[PDB]
Scaffold this active site. Structure first.
Site, PDB file in Angstrom:
ATOM      1  N   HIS A  25       0.911  -1.118   0.080  1.00  0.00           N
ATOM      2  CA  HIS A  25      -0.085  -0.071  -0.002  1.00  0.00           C
ATOM      3  C   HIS A  25       0.900   1.110   0.006  1.00  0.00           C
ATOM      4  CE1 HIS A  25      -3.791  -2.340   1.600  1.00  0.00           C
ATOM      5  NE2 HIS A  25      -3.142  -2.903   0.554  1.00  0.00           N
ATOM      6  N   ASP A  26       2.015   1.033   0.399  1.00  0.00           N
ATOM      7  CA  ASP A  26       2.753   2.328   0.416  1.00  0.00           C
ATOM      8  C   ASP A  26       3.358   2.600  -1.055  1.00  0.00           C
ATOM      9  OD1 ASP A  26       4.667   4.469   1.298  1.00  0.00           O
ATOM     10  OD2 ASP A  26       6.162   3.406   1.488  1.00  0.00           O
ATOM     11  N   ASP A  45       7.908   5.702  -0.611  1.00  0.00           N
ATOM     12  CA  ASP A  45       8.466   6.834   0.298  1.00  0.00           C
ATOM     13  C   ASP A  45       7.906   6.872   1.630  1.00  0.00           C
ATOM     14  OD1 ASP A  45       5.651   7.130   0.117  1.00  0.00           O
ATOM     15  OD2 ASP A  45       5.985   9.208  -1.160  1.00  0.00           O
ATOM     16  N   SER A  63       5.322   7.487   2.826  1.00  0.00           N
ATOM     17  CA  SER A  63       4.059   8.324   3.003  1.00  0.00           C
ATOM     18  C   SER A  63       2.874   7.858   3.975  1.00  0.00           C
ATOM     19  CB  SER A  63       3.459   8.924   1.880  1.00  0.00           C
ATOM     20  OG  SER A  63       3.018   7.560   0.974  1.00  0.00           O
ATOM     21  N   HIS A  79       0.497 -13.607  -0.798  1.00  0.00           N
ATOM     22  CA  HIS A  79      -0.962 -14.246   0.019  1.00  0.00           C
ATOM     23  C   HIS A  79      -0.719 -15.634   0.492  1.00  0.00           C
ATOM     24  CE1 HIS A  79      -4.216 -11.090  -1.562  1.00  0.00           C
ATOM     25  NE2 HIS A  79      -3.290 -10.499  -0.863  1.00  0.00           N
ATOM     26  N   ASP A 128      -4.411 -19.457   2.615  1.00  0.00           N
ATOM     27  CA  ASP A 128      -3.858 -20.681   2.171  1.00  0.00           C
ATOM     28  C   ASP A 128      -3.655 -21.638   3.574  1.00  0.00           C
ATOM     29  OD1 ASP A 128      -1.041 -20.434   3.010  1.00  0.00           O
ATOM     30  OD2 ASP A 128      -0.318 -20.658   0.938  1.00  0.00           O
ATOM     31  N   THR A 145      -1.289 -22.983   4.778  1.00  0.00           N
ATOM     32  CA  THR A 145       0.261 -22.872   5.614  1.00  0.00           C
ATOM     33  C   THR A 145       0.363 -21.183   5.693  1.00  0.00           C
ATOM     34  OG1 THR A 145       1.300 -22.909   3.165  1.00  0.00           O
ATOM     35  CG2 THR A 145       1.118 -25.062   4.609  1.00  0.00           C
ATOM     36  N   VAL A 198       4.264 -20.543   6.053  1.00  0.00           N
ATOM     37  CA  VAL A 198       5.267 -21.075   5.173  1.00  0.00           C
ATOM     38  C   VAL A 198       5.173 -20.348   3.968  1.00  0.00           C
ATOM     39  CG1 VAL A 198       6.230 -23.059   4.304  1.00  0.00           C
ATOM     40  CG2 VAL A 198       5.039 -23.379   6.367  1.00  0.00           C
ATOM     41  N   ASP A 221       5.294 -20.813   0.365  1.00  0.00           N
ATOM     42  CA  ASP A 221       5.123 -21.719  -0.398  1.00  0.00           C
ATOM     43  C   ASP A 221       4.253 -21.422  -1.704  1.00  0.00           C
ATOM     44  OD1 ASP A 221       2.550 -22.170   1.143  1.00  0.00           O
ATOM     45  OD2 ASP A 221       3.359 -23.852   1.823  1.00  0.00           O
TER      46      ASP A 221
END
Ligand code: HEM
Ligand SMILES: *[C@@H]1O[C@H](CO)[C@@H](O[C@@H]2O[C@H](CO)[C@@H](O)[C@H](O)[C@H]2NC(C)=O)[C@H](O)[C@H]1NC(C)=O
Ligand SMILES: [C-]#N
Ligand SMILES: [Ca+2]
Ligand SMILES: [Ca+2]
Length: 336
Positions: free
Chosen positions: A48-49, A69, A71, A176, A194, A196, A199, A201
């Site tokens: 998001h930055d 930056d 922000s 994700h 997911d 894990t 982890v 993966d």
């Protein structure tokens, strides 16, 4: 030659302060070098930055955003009111105190805490770390963060304007694999994306391709889709990108090799880390980042499901041969 006060060796004098913020982050922010919610919230924060960067706005005479930056911290008062930035305030304040205490720029701090947080999660690659980003920033313009209810065309256009090809969007989504949601369906707080969540993966790419069969909570949340088994959450944009013709073959190629996924993700993240900057003006302090423990598990289709349960969507490549697990369907515990 360059030896830092603690006796470690580094390529440049500018890297020595980062050994101190490493100790602080591992002890405090990461609660003893854990791979739990602080890491997952920092991965949302670095995206998001950095994504508040729009060449098209610049082209139309408007301020397009400064990219990576810091922000989101320096201007948290305006950026955390954005729809996509909920559930981040506590993490942003913790990062703010660390940046002010060590005297490092906010943009650099976010990139560093991302590389360090990822080193606590098994299977992660060593991310590049560059220092030198100016601490001065202006607020990100609104509406530059892709949302889970957006179409694939909308996501690809936004990501493309920032500079990423459709393949790189799929590569960036490897994050994700260490994820949960808290604000889309709060009735199933921290439901993993997911099986894990601790982890790094390929399971995320495999499991979003399985047929949606189960509603994990009492009702459906914003942009929620049916998932493949109890406790797992599936958001609409992930389901759609897995299946869209523009992104499906790259998504399928990420299912069988943890090694390929990790190099692809490392390359895409290094590009994202310098959005709004010239990497040749920054100093490389990658050697400060420690190694993660290796992941020794092979990719698997979980709980007795087979290749007949994945909705193959890449028309030109046969689905890779992945192992199957002998057992009842899993039910996932909340991510820690
Ligand atoms: C391509 C567009 C993407 C969309 C639409 C998207 C959307 C979301 C949403 C809605 C959540 C759930 C947040 C919550 O309710 O708590 C989520 C979680 C997460 N996302 Fe993304 N995401 C995308 C890309 C990325 C990328 C590129 C990264 C970073 C490299 C990332 C890292 C994460 C992480 C780690 C979490 C889990 C946070 C947690 O467990 O608290 N996402 N994402
Ligand atoms: C980077 O810039 C921010 C301002 O945007 C500085 O943050 C402030 O720092 C002072 C102490 O130096 C705090 O009392 C303020 O509350 C901070 N403001 C915000 C919005 O966080 C920060 O000091 C700067 N860092 C460096 C190294 O220049
Ligand atoms: C993810 N944002
Ligand atoms: Ca920014
Ligand atoms: Ca995972």
């Amino acid at each position: 030659s360059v030896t830092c006060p603690g006796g470690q060796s580094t390529s440049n004098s500018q890297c020595c302060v980062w050994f101190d913020v490493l100790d602080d982050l591992q002890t405090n922010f990461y609660q003893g070098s854990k791979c739990e919610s602080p890491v997952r919230k920092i991965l949302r924060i670095v995206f998001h930055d950095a994504i508040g960067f729009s060449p098209a706005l610049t082209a139309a005479g408007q301020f397009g955003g400064g990219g990576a930056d810091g922000s989101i911290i320096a201007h948290s008062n305006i950026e955390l009111a954005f729809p996509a930035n909920g559930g981040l305030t506590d993490t942003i304040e913790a990062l703010r105190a660390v940046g002010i205490n060590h005297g490092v720029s906010f943009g650099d701090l976010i990139q560093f805490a991302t590389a360090v947080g990822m080193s606590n999660c098994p299977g992660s690659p060593r991310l590049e770390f560059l220092t030198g980003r100016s601490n001065s920033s202006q607020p990100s313009p609104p509406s530059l963060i892709p949302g889970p209810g957006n179409t694939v065309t909308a996501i690809l256009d936004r990501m493309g304007d920032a500079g990423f090809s459709p393949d790189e969007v799929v590569d960036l989504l490897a994050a994700h694999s260490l994820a949960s949601q808290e604000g889309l369906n709060s009735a199933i707080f921290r439901s993993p994306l997911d099986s894990t969540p601790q982890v790094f993966d390929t399971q995320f790419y495999i499991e979003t391709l399985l047929k949606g069969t189960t509603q994990p909570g009492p009702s459906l949340g914003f942009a929620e889709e049916l998932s493949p088994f109890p406790g797992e959450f599936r958001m609409r944009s992930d389901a759609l990108l897995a299946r869209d013709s523009r992104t499906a073959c790259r998504w399928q190629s990420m299912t069988s090799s943890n090694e390929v996924m990790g190099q692809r993700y490392r390359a895409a993240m290094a590009k994202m880390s310098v959005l709004g900057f010239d990497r040749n003006a920054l100093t490389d302090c990658s050697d400060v980042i420690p190694s993660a423990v290796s992941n020794n598990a092979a990719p698997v289709i979980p709980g007795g499901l087979t290749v007949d349960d994945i909705e193959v969507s890449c028309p030109s490549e046969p689905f890779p041969e992945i192992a199957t697990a002998s057992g009842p369907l899993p039910s996932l515990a909340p991510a820690p």
